[PDB]
Amino acid sequence: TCPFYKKIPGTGFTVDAFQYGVVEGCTAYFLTHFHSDHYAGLSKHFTFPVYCSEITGNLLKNKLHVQEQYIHPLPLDTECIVNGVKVVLLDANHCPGAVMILFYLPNGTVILHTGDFRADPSMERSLLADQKVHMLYLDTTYCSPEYTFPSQQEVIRFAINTAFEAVTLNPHALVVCGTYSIGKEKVFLAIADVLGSKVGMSQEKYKTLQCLNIPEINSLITTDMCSSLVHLLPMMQINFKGLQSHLKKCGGKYNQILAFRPTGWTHSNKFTRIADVIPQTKGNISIYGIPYSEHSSYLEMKRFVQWLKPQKIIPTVNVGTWKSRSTMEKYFREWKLEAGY
Ligand code: NI
Structure with a gap:
């Protein structure tokens, strides 16, 4: 069963959720990048629409033999409508073809899902500059100052x-x-x-x-x-x-x-x-x-989040232990108190 931090509320969408069988209510499956923990479950027998970058779609077709008719590649930095919802794909500074996804919900909420990313100050001048983000689904792999x-x-x-x-x-x-x-x-x-x-x-x-x-x-x-x-x-x-x-x-x-x-x-x-x-x-x-x-290193992560000023953060990595979850929540609160949002 698909965990909550892979579901985008107010949509038919999931992110990186191919290992759960047919997910109830899902009309479009997004794939952020071609790393096995994220594509786990895809094959030539998959028959739902997969939305991804051009490079990820080349890998799906040639390496996993997903049929062409189910691969929906999107250009980067370009407003696209998917099943009635505006989305943008942004470069994640991770591996080739890796993206973050901006979802513009029908009720006015804006959600950023980072996939896997290495935060960089250059992101502060992408299409993120132009509007407020309510919810951040964050790659917290190295969310501790020792990293x-x-x-x-x-x-x-x-x-x-x-x-x-x-x-x-x-x-x-x-x-x-x-x-x-x-x-x-x-x-x-x-x-x-x-x-x-x-x-x-x-x-x-x-x-x-x-x-x-x-x-x-x-x-x-x-x-x-x-x-x-x-x-x-x-x-x-x-x-x-x-x-x-x-x-x-x-x-x-x-x-x-x-x-x-x-x-x-x-x-x-x-x-x-x-x-x-x-x-x-x-x-x-x-x-x-x-x-x-x-x-991201801890400091690169912290700089990005303090710049973005999200209303809510949903971690996507290190979620399986109470000690990890409590550590990450403490840092999010520090960051918010220091910056004033
Ligand atoms: Ni990855």
Whole structure:
């Protein structure tokens, strides 16, 4: 049974609610982005209207085989009428094709559902600037002040400088980057650009990347692993055993691996600056954990909410424990008292 924080009152709509069977009263199912916890339940047998971005609809059709007649892609930053209700899709600064959804209810209430997002000051000059928002369905993944991490730009500078140094010292070093979902493509694309290489990967991952509308992508990726010195592997294989085994398969072309695991936050963030990050090393294999986040830090979240000034907040993450729910409610009240709304 569909939980209340996935339902939009005063409409026939749900958000990210495909794992509950036929939801009573639902006339249109929205999908914020193509991450498995959110699409859970969709397949070629789904026969209700799905509303999403162009990029998410490419993934639904090619990866999950949803039939074309049920996919309803909408342009961004554009007022659209869906089943009698005005909606807008906004870029969520999460993974490719990820959106926030503005719903303009027939009674005059305005609701923003962030999906998953990484708040940014640039959002303060989107179509959000233009009206009041009553209710905020908020991605609270990192809603506690311990969650700090650097900008994506600082993290990418670290990765590029680290990979270029290693491979210039040793032209026989291979770079490997872990992945298990879409998102974070800048990590492996920036490293391959500095090295003058295409990124090599499985046919299944190439297929996924080809759905993403990234400019000049045919110039940047390949399935020919032998021609590439940046390889993508499943995240599960980014350990000493898995990397040893990969280096065997390369036929003595390489004699060292430098590997990256883009995580979200880890508690090494509470002590260490990006500049000071060091790898775990065993023999000729080194593994860097880099804090590349596609969700808001606590401070970025707080700035967005204090700017928006919603009347009510409904968290969408960390809702399963009373301690989490009580912590989040305390911060929402602090923010409101400090800013005066
Ligand atoms: Ni996500």
